Amino acid sequence: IQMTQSPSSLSASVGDRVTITCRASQDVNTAVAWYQQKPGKAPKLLIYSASFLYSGVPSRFSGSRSGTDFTLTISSLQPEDFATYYCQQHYTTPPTFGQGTKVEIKRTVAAPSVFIFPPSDEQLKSGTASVVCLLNNFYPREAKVQWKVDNALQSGNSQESVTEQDSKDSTYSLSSTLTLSKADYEKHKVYACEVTHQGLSSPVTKSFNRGE
Amino acid sequence: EVQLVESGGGLVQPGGSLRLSCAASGFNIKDTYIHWVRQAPGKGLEWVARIYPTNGYTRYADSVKGRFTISADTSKNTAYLQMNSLRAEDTAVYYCSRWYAMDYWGQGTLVTVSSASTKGPSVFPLAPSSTAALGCLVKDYFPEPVTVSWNSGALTSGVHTFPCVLQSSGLYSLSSVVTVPSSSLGTQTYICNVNHKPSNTKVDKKVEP
Ligand SMILES: [Co+2]
Ligand SMILES: [Co+2]
């Protein structure tokens, strides 16, 4: 038995209505449950037997059935509900989970403030230099970060990482790290980080020169 | 109060073995079914095995059939899961749970199957210039977890601790920063507290402008 979940991704604003559908490949009867999972953490029971609210969760969540089509609906959304939601059948072993539905809180466009960090003197002694670009509390997640070593656009030597949506202002933060050998790092002077974002009218560039 | 806690787990060589224990409080396992559900990082939950402690019947998954063994000890109120011939595919967070819908879970344990040896992290400071930003750089380390706190837990507002990124060395790295007023730069002291249990490495770094 395979359970299929739609939509795989979701982005609805606060107070909106969210509906999440779960298809059963075979008959699973009412033996289904709906779960919610914050990043890492542990799944929390929301709905049991396709319709019944769990003791402890608000009545904003609800569950219904249309044969093999099980839908979980949120009446009023809150920004405390950024999570991935799962549907699980338990009619026959093995108990099958859904593919997951990551819901994102939608908000207004917020430009990112940008900082650039030169490599530390301790890391330079090790033999590696790391230049960090930090994008601070922005929305949406989509952003382009490019590096310009001595005004030369780099390619493939940068790694990126983004935080989960903030529980207060529903923003993301991003880190782009430029990792080079200390030898090449001691070869060039001007290190620059260029950010383009929907909330930036022009692409902002924060930079530093070795020997500042 | 009713809770479940999992122990055991960590770095395991491929083809190796490792056993996980899930202890139960606030209820008797003999009254319910005990489940082990795993989840690879950002890959969704996959059911592994089930046991009914009062009779001992064990139901497994085909992705684990043969090399896994799930047992129970109704007297100690804990369930077990023995895993042999561990593969990289088996790397995941392993949860424990009970039934009938699975209501109460456990925090889980990290089972990592890799040939990379345990390595402690190197911690470097990210200092501000000229709001202002500062942070720490958790360099090559393996395996996860790594706790990062600021001022032993005092500093909590404006902190962003980024997830791990796999590096070309086969080791992980992460950065943790915090948004602070530029006036606080001279007056206030900022220290980040890095905690890597697998290597038993604890480093506190004072980030100085
Ligand atoms: Co089938
Ligand atoms: Co921030």
Author numbering:
A (entry chain L): 2 to 213
B (entry chain H): 1 to 99, 105 to 135, 142 to 220
Original authors' sentences:
ADCs uniquely combine the target-specificity and extended half-life of antibodies with the potent cytotoxicity of small-molecule chemotherapeutic payloads. Given the foundational research on its site-specific conjugates, we use as a model ADC the well-studied Her2 receptor-targeting antibody trastuzumab conjugated with a cleavable Ala-Ala p-aminobenzyloxycarbonyl (PABC) linker to the potent antimitotic payload monomethyl auristatin E (MMAE). Methods: In this work, we present the crystal structures of trastuzumab Fab and Fc domains site-specifically conjugated with a cleavable linker–payload. Results: Our findings suggest that pockets within both Fab and Fc regions may interact with and shield the linker portion of the conjugate.
